[PDB]
Amino acid sequence: MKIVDVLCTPGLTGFYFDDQRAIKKGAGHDGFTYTGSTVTEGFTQVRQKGESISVLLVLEDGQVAHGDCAAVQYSGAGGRDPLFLAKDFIPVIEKEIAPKLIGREITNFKPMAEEFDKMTVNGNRLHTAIRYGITQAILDAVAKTRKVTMAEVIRDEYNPGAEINAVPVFAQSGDDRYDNVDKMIIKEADVLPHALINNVEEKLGLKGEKLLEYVKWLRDRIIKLRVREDYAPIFHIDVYGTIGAAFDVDIKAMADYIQTLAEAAKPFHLRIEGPMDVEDRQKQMEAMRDLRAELDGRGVDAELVADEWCNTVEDVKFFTDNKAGHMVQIKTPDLGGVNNIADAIMYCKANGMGAYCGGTCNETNRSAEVTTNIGMACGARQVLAKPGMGVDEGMMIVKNEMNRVLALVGRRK
């Protein structure tokens, strides 16, 4: 089977591109917009529509494979590739990539995905978002050629012999950490709710008092609203390094605090993402390692999730190799080629580290379907409901895909 044509179309996403640098220099929050001058290259307003590029690969038999290029909300921010405007990157795909795809035989996903993930143009690597979208489309093309699901392709190529089953779905609340929780409970999210605890005094509390009350609140809310008594989701709260800040990265003090949080969450299990966020990757690894070591040694059944400083596949392996947390966030859009997602998850699995197959609110429905398949194929510990901030839409997209995939796999089981 070959690819006979390649089409790219500009699109929207579940959210916005925001000029994070400008916001930090004082941009005006006004309704759902930001007023003021931009600071980051490429931005014409401080908040702009998020953009995607749909990459369609027409196969010889007339089927059409589909992936979507997309980037994070803070596209173009520090350490990121440039602002991902379709009008700027469509021409790159059309001129430099499409000709290497047209006429190409569809064989196995892994070598093809790796080739495009690493491809250069004028000696420079491709924008992460392009690699994301092109490899998604390649995955779909292999699946469509073999007449199986994307999950089955990945399982075959990265997790041979494994069953494909459902994976818990994690929903994120943003700042609306009360009403969005109600949504999550009603929609039966398996893991919730992120809660955006990104300020020490205002959100955590100086000595963690506010977060402690929040956990209590969330516990009681679940019990109050759940439709069935056996609905018992897992708490996952991102503190953006505030626990480290509140407690001067004192391993014992942090452990003591987290212990009280876990006691308050009972009977729900607790995962804390980003407890500390220190000054370099090495010391982040050490602090996560040692904090996990302390909690485990105490028999405190609360898990730590790595995020800050753990970005690339090499980072994932580093954090895994040093048991630096219990779970590692696999940052789908940032990894470029989706093959990297599979390699990262499989490394964690082989080495006893939990893998959280993540994402962004600024990606698309299609990219979410694709990465959800990969997560299922690799046996991720959780996948993110995405994209968007409405909660309902992201949960629908990911969970409905998951169920359909499981039904189709079941026909060949």
Nearer residue to a second copy within complex by CB, 341 or 405: 405
**111 upstream amide cis, omega within 30 of 0:** no
Binding region for a second copy (CB under 8 A): 5, 7-16, 31-33, 44-45, 47-50, 52, 54, 56, 58, 61-64, 66, 68, 144, 147, 178-183, 186-188, 225, 227, 364-366, 387-397, 399-400, 403-404, 406-408, 411
Q: Which of 245, 303, 250, 241 is nearest to 274 (CA)?
A: 241
The listed partner (Mg ion, a second copy, none) that binds 21, CB under 5 to 8 Å by sort, is: none
The listed partner (Mg ion, a second copy, none) that binds 274, CB under 5 to 8 Å by sort, is: Mg ion
Sorted by sequence, the CB contacts under 8 Å of residue 353 that are 6+ apart come out as 319, 320, 323, 325, 326, 327, 328, 347
The listed partner (Mg ion, a second copy, none) that binds 56, CB under 5 to 8 Å by sort, is: a second copy
Q: How far apart are the first and last CA of the chain?
A: 25
Nearer residue to a second copy within complex by CB, 33 or 107: 33
Q: Tell me if 310 is assigned to a ligand binding site.
A: no
The listed partner (a second copy, Mg ion, none) that binds 14, CB under 5 to 8 Å by sort, is: a second copy
Nearer residue to Mg ion within complex by CB, 292 or 366: 292
Count CB-CB contacts under 10 A for residue 301.
12
Instruction: Count the residues in the chain.
Output: 413
Closest distance between a second copy and the C-beta of residue 170, in Å?
A: 15
The listed partner (Mg ion, a second copy, none) that binds 238, CB under 5 to 8 Å by sort, is: Mg ion
Element (H, E) at 55: strand 52-59
The listed partner (Mg ion, a second copy, none) that binds 399, CB under 5 to 8 Å by sort, is: a second copy
Report if residue 277 touches Mg ion, rule: CB under 5 A: no
170 pairs with which residues across the strands? 191, 384
Q: Which of 192, 191, 168 is nearest to 179 (CA)?
A: 192
Closest distance between a second copy and the C-beta of residue 186, in Å?
A: 5
Angstrom distances, CA of residue 272 to CA of 39, 301, 375: 33, 11, 21
Nearer residue to Mg ion within complex by CB, 11 or 274: 274
Q: Which residue has the tokens 């500009």?
A: 10
Based on the number of CB atoms within 10 Å of its own CB, is 398 exposed (0-12), middle (13-18) or buried (19 or more)? buried
- Cα distance between residue 154 and residue 147, in whole Å: 14
Residues 380-409 that bind Mg ion (CB under 5 A): none
**Which residues are marked as active site?**
331
Element (H, E) at 243: helix 242-246
Sorted by sequence, the CB contacts under 8 Å of residue 27 that are 6+ apart come out as 19, 34, 35, 36, 37, 46
- Cα distance between residue 3 and residue 23, in whole Å: 44
Q: Tell me if 360 is assigned to a ligand binding site.
A: yes
Residues 222-261 that bind Mg ion (CB under 5 A): 238
Nearer residue to Mg ion within complex by CB, 51 or 238: 238
| Residue nearest to Mg ion according to CB distances in the complex | 307
Question: β-pairing, 16-18 with 234-238?
Answer: unpaired
Q: Tell me if 63 is assigned to a ligand binding site.
A: no
Nearer residue to a second copy within complex by CB, 187 or 281: 187
Residues 300-319 that bind Mg ion (CB under 5 A): 307
Q: Tell me if 88 is assigned to a ligand binding site.
A: no
Q: Tell me if 361 is assigned to a ligand binding site.
A: yes
Closest distance between Mg ion and the C-beta of residue 198, in Å?
A: 9
Closest distance between a second copy and the C-beta of residue 12, in Å?
A: 4
Of positions 76, 274, 354, 379, contacts Mg ion by CB under 5 A: 274
Task: Give the CA radius of gyration of the chain.
Answer: 21
Residues annotated within the binding site are: 172, 238, 273, 307, 329, 360-361
Binding residues for (2S,3S)-3-methyl-L-aspartate: 172, 329, 360-361
**Which residues are near Mg ion by CB under 5 A?**
238, 273-274, 307
Binding residue numbers for Mg(2+): 238, 273, 307
